Design a protein around this ligand. Structure first.
Ligand SMILES: Nc1ncnc2c1ncn2[C@@H]1O[C@H](COP(=O)(O)OP(=O)(O)OP(=O)(O)O)[C@@H](O)[C@H]1O
Ligand SMILES: Nc1ncnc2c1ncn2[C@@H]1O[C@H](COP(=O)(O)OP(=O)(O)OP(=O)(O)O)[C@@H](O)[C@H]1O
Ligand SMILES: Nc1ncnc2c1ncn2[C@@H]1O[C@H](COP(=O)(O)O)[C@@H](O)[C@H]1O
Ligand SMILES: Nc1ncnc2c1ncn2[C@@H]1O[C@H](COP(=O)(O)O)[C@@H](O)[C@H]1O
Ligand SMILES: [Mg+2]
Ligand SMILES: [Mg+2]
Lengths: 271, 271
């Protein structure tokens, strides 16, 4: 089945044991860092569900490593573009995560400079959509810079519900070293957050990429036109409307390039 | 055999037919663009060998596309960080490539704006090494912005002699849509340029990533500690000294991460 194939490719489980998922995902983080000899992790904290979940798992992983007499640290970093409208949630996220270090890097001046030079060289203004993708790539650079200066791995927040739709920026939030949330559906992620003792405000929060200047904090589902719950039912193998399965299936193939290393002539996935 | 496994993973032919290689690679470019319905390609033209070769292939593919009655175009772009020391070679490359459009985007103001914020936020100054990586990722953003504005795909110039040593910036120049030079060694590449009639200056100069301010135009061979000729003999399946094989193989395993999508607990390669 196409749905069965996707489920298997994305590593989704129809049902999970939240306590055990948390243990294994924290152990993955611990084992990876130790194998590489890295000094910890860095992650951009948005105030959204996924980063809040991934950020707490990272914090639990570095605490465990030190308990074992190792040395590891977690740097949480806010990356607003000027004034973030839901900064309050970010601040709440931080209180809940309790990271070893909380940094900040406002990306407005870089993005501005980039924009101004674009129009000056080409005579065109960047569209809102293209500017939104510049913002997402700038956050990548910012995280890689901190990671580079401090000897840390960059965590990525991709999970099955964002993966199936290719809903992330190529080499932007998609640019990361490791993925602790792989295989989890949106609802399964909320379950994990609930078991961790997270504030309800962080997991009943409407998912948003908030990249646009013309339409702040726009909802994922709006941009998508399918509900995350429909998405979760499909991935968890529940039966859904054919109108649902076909639109999901089509977007998945169309976004395969985001899930693979750059194409060459020796690759067949694209043919 | 380790050498033999690398050769196969990297797609290297111990022996090639240059005219056939040219045809295959120009056809892959035409095949991809038709499948995806993209309008053409964009690529950064450095004045070094690799970008000169890829740029010429690209130009040939779009001219061939337009001959069969299709529509496709090629934008060649200069990405100097202020004044590029070998700008003269880059101008010579454009003259050989003969692209449909040649644009320019100076990344210096974006890089300075970034470095300045870094220091304002962290109180630290970027190392020359880390700043060099910001230049590379900024060039990626520039190309993806032009591609986004115009509807084009981003070509990347990675080839086997760069892949084997992980000599490219992750999500910097490693960030692209498709790779026309995959499997070619440095010398095989020179052979293709000789077949296409390129100016000798373009493949006689020393390869350099030129990302550093403190040590501009530093040659790869200096950074690497091995020459491109020892690298090519290894890749080509020739019996090299124990000292080349050791160094190469050590370097390859340490950079595997640059050659896979981000690691998850479900991947085995990292264990
Ligand atoms: N089939 C393809 N193969 C390889 N690269 C592709 C393909 N289709 C598009 N691309 C590249 O990917 C970019 C789009 O990816 P990006 O991460 O920006 O998603 P987005 O534009 O934010 O949203 P959308 O999901 O609507 O594409 C394009 O501008 C192009 O460079
Ligand atoms: N084993 C690993 N797994 C995943 N990511 C890693 C691993 N080792 C390093 N990294 C990440 O890769 C980055 C290094 O890649 P990058 O392109 O920046 O290379 P570089 O430092 O310019 O050159 P080199 O890596 O050859 O010294 C590090 O900042 C870190 O975030
Ligand atoms: N304003 C922000 N501040 C910090 N990190 C951010 C910000 N926006 C996005 N991120 C990062 O980008 C990832 C993807 O966001 P999203 O598109 O909402 O799924 C988040 O999980 C964060 O790690
Ligand atoms: N000064 C530059 N101008 C334009 N493109 C460049 C520049 N430097 C690097 N690039 C691009 O980056 C790729 C990698 O360069 P290199 O590290 O020299 O192998 C090149 O093949 C170009 O496509
Ligand atoms: Mg998210
Ligand atoms: Mg090169």
């Amino acid at each position: 089945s196409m749905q069965e194939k996707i489920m298997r490719e994305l590593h989704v489980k129809p049902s999970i044991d939240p306590k055990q998922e948390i243990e294994d995902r924290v152990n993955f983080l611990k084992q990876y860092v130790k194998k590489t000899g890295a000094k910890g992790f860095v992650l951009g904290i948005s105030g959204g569900q996924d980063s809040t979940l991934a950020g707490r798992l990272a914090q639990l992983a570095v605490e465990s490593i030190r308990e074992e007499g190792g040395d590891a640290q977690f740097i949480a970093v806010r990356l607003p573009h000027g004034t973030q409208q839901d900064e309050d949630d970010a601040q709440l996220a931080l209180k809940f995560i309790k990271p070893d270090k909380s940094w900040k890097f406002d990306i407005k001046s870089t993005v501005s400079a980039f924009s101004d030079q674009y129009q000056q060289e080409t005579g065109d203004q960047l569209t809102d959509f293209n500017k939104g993708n510049v913002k997402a790539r700038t956050r990548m650079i910012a995280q890689y810079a901190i990671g580079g200066q401090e000897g840390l791995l960059v965590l990525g927040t991709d999970h099955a519900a964002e993966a199936v739709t290719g809903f992330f920026t190529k080499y932007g939030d998609g640019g990361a070293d490791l993925l602790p949330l792989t295989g989890l559906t949106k609802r399964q992620g909320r379950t994990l957050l609930k078991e961790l003792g997270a504030p309800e405000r962080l997991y009943l929060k409407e998912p948003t990429a908030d990249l646009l200047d013309e339409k702040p904090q726009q909802s994922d589902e709006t941009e998508l036109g399918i509900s995350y719950d429909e998405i979760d039912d499909y991935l968890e193998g529940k039966e859904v409307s054919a109108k649902v399965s076909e639109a999901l299936e089509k977007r998945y193939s169309m976004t395969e390039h985001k899930r693979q290393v750059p194409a060459s002539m020796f690759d067949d996935w694209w043919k």
